[PDB]
Amino acid sequence: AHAPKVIVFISGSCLFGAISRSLFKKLPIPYTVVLLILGAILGVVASNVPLVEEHTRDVAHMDPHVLLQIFLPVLIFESAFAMDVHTFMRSFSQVCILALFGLVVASVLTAVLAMNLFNYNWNFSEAMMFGAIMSATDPVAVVALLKDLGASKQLGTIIEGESLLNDGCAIVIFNVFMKMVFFPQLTSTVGQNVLYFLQVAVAGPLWGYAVAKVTVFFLSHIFNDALVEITITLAATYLTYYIGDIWLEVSGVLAVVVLGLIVNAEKTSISPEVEVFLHRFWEMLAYLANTLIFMMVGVVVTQKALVAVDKMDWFYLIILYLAITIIRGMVISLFSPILSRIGYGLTWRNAVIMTWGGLRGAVGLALALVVENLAGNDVIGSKFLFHTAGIVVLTLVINATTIQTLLRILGMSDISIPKRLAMAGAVRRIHEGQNRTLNMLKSDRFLADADWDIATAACEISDPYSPSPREFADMMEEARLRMLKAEKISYWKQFEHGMLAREALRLLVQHAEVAADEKDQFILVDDLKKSWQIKGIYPWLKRKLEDLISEKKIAKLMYKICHHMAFEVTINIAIVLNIVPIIMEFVVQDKMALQKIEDALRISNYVFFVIYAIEAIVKILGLGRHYIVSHWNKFDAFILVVALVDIIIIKVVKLFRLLRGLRMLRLTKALIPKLILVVNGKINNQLSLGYDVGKGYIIGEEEVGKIIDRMVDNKKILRELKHISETGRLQVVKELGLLQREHPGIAVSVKTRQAIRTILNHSRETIHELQGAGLLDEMEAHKLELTVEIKMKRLMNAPSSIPPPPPENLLKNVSWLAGDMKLIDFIKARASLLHFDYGEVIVREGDESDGLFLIVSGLVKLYGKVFEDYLTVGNVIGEMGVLTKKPRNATVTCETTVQVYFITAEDMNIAIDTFTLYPSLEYRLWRVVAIRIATPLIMEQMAFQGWTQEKVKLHLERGYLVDLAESHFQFNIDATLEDVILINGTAYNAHTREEIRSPCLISRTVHKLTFQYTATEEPRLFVVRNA
């Protein structure tokens, strides 16, 4: 008889939920309504059949607190965890104005209604509870509908976020007014109310934020332990509510709301495979919670609530339903002028959807169950549940069912022409693909006898949506609209390969859409700047905090110990330990208002004072008279002044603050660096986004500029577009380069994070390629792919700021120098560093090439015959003037203060002729040039296919230069030779004796290349072999 009878009810409710969700899958009525009917049926039979009553009693009569403690954390957290937080923040003010202030008016008006209309003679407190529970909305259905039909970019999240905040605040108001109705306290002190307000409203979010930032800290330090990650998430979610609500008397719901939002924002710290599990897991838990609440409501509403329902109650139900409907619309319209100025605004049709889509749900019902249990035999409990359930039913029966048609009437359900065209094209391409497979299968000997009628009928994919200037402007608009489409595609292809973060993709696509809507409007670079524009607050904080710990002024073993890190670390650790005595002794004294402990801990304070005294002794003997120079030491001398002056002695009570203050304050020296790190983190986030948007736009323009050549007919239009794109690209590449100069360390951090991530991604691909070809066992491959996963998670713990390498390091890591230590020594011992001021010219067109240059600082603009570009740290200039002894091809101007490593041409010839091993210096230098020339050519040839610039760069990377001497002629293999690029010199076609210009992609029709040994120019050829 000790079996947990709650098991059958919980499991049975799951089966009934499955049945309802299955049968009413295509019908309009939401399944939750069916669950309520089933619960009512269970209730009526339970009144007659005692056996079932014994199986429903333990859940139907659930204690009220346990209801809140278990279900609300799931419902609230799941709602928060499922939000599109980025869009939520971009409209946070718009949500808050409507969610918080709108809630107050909506509930109070409802409370006034409930006091005046209803004959229950409720007072204001009960009426406010009524209004609070009536203002909680669960639009899960409406947001789901909008996600498919469109306008989900803003509206779906506004209603979802508004519902989240409204539910969060409703529980707060309900918690406040419940205590004044069922647990009244007479004290009613005016001052305490302010304190009480701060705890529920202000402390809650802070508690949630603290727990969230602790949680994500550990989650980022867990590798390959998915179970631990999931368990940590669960325990953090449940302890946040429990500790906050019970131990701290702090608003649990708000703490969980912040915790859910913060964790959702920090999803990168969760392993990708655990993230997808958690989303489905929390969804499942919320689904279970919803079903239980509806079934419980159905059971109890029939058992003890409908027994005491009068005729007028039904009348008031309809009136109340109408009132809450008009009240929501009035509130939305009343704030409409404000919402127009703050955020995205509200169109009249969008407002109607918000007004009509305000469905009530479980959160409202759960609170009603609490009143029913708490009210006991009072009619308040029954009529609270009656109206809550009734309004829930009506909103589910009417609002939830007609919203689909209303969205059509307002014309919001219409699918745009581009979507229809894309879907039709996709369906047709899939349809064609199946036909190709069908022909292939019919030729198979094994499968030749299959029933093809059934196969074709059962695998069909169906479309679910089924020269005059006056004339000249039409051509312009078509090109503009078509180019904007190519840009949108270009961003998407980048996202698939991981070159672009999702936020940058969304920003770029949104900007493209905004441009398309307006007439004669292209994507505005001056509008893109809002991404990589670092607001001054964070740089100011960084500089100010760095100033506070500028130890440059401070800059026989006592001196050595004074400057050893272990000394400071140990003493700071002692001080943080010394917090415990400080709290303990004074807490004991407060409790005392025995003395044995007090006397004992006063001695320990002397011990800690002695520790600090020996610290000071070491510091002074290390630095001598110059110890007092630093303000920090002055404070640490003042603390020991207090020690000496007050160790001897309101004589007792005055000592606590003196002991506390200085000791607890002198920890800030160890805190300031952490705040510097945090501020770097904030700058690192914004800067990282800036590079993505800027880099994405630059690559998008570069790619599209070679697709628009074939797409637009009118030449004058072609010139027009290629000019705007060039201006925008130069603007971005210049502005983006400057950010590096402003924040060198953070820029290096960002650039290293991308570099590693790109390496690991392609490292992951080869494993799949090896596994895909079967060359590696599945278990062995999975073992390797784990190491990649942990490495990519260690990436997100990398320091936000990395000190930039000194110039000597740059020489080591150059492509055509890395690896050969002897060569690096030769160059490093001959390269001379130079400095330049703003606007100074390093080189000029036609001027004789004197020596190479490597940029170690600053930014330089290039102007050559017209092509213009900007180059920055790490780039090399002067390579094609040394490799071929020819005048310079471009002018170089220093857009800012610049430093360069100058290697004289005379050195290069010596370096070239000295290092002649297989990885020849001249070979590598030419290879670097060749890839830079080849990429534009191959991109131009192959841009109209699915080839992104990264792939072409990788494709060329596999190539190599041909010696061209041991084989004076190059013969064009097709099987193992994919493409051939000429980089220098000229070649003669054997079958035509035609000459081909130096920078050209050898056409496939050429079968053999014949070369010459004239000393004027050594021809150079680049070849990339096939798989």
Ligand SMILES: Nc1nc2c(ncn2[C@@H]2O[C@@H]3COP(=O)(O)O[C@H]3[C@H]2O)c(=O)[nH]1
């Ligand atoms: N013209 C041109 N020069 C480049 C480019 N990238 C780097 N450079 C350097 O600009 C230098 C100017 O002409 P040089 O012959 O001195 O050698 C050139 C290259 O080393 C580029 O993309 N185009």
